[PDB]
Amino acid sequence: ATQTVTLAVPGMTCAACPITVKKALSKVEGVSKVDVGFEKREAVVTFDDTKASVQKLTKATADAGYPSSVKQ
Numbered sequence: 001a002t003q004t005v006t007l008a009v010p011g012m013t014c015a016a017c018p019i020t021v022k023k024a025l026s027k028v029e030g031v032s033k034v035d036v037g038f039e040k041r042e043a044v045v046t047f048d049d050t051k052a053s054v055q056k057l058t059k060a061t062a063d064a065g066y067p068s069s070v071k072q
């Protein structure tokens with residue numbers, strides 16, 4: 001119950017929304033670590049699948065308002 005994947009959130013592309021995706025995986029649930037890229041719409045996060053999951057990661061940014069995807 002501890003996986004780490006990357007995320008593709010083209011929902012935006014500047015110093016403000018992609019970084020929000022970082023706040024999304026950090027607020028997704030079991031996220032244990034996060035490291036994305038602003039304008040480079042790319043979030044790489046680690047977490048505990050016991051309470052979260054690669055799906056919940058793309059869903060956290062998708063919930064921030066940035067319909068993204070995942071590609072561990």
Ligand SMILES: [Hg+2]
Pocket residue numbers: 012013014015016017018
């Ligand atoms: Hg932005």
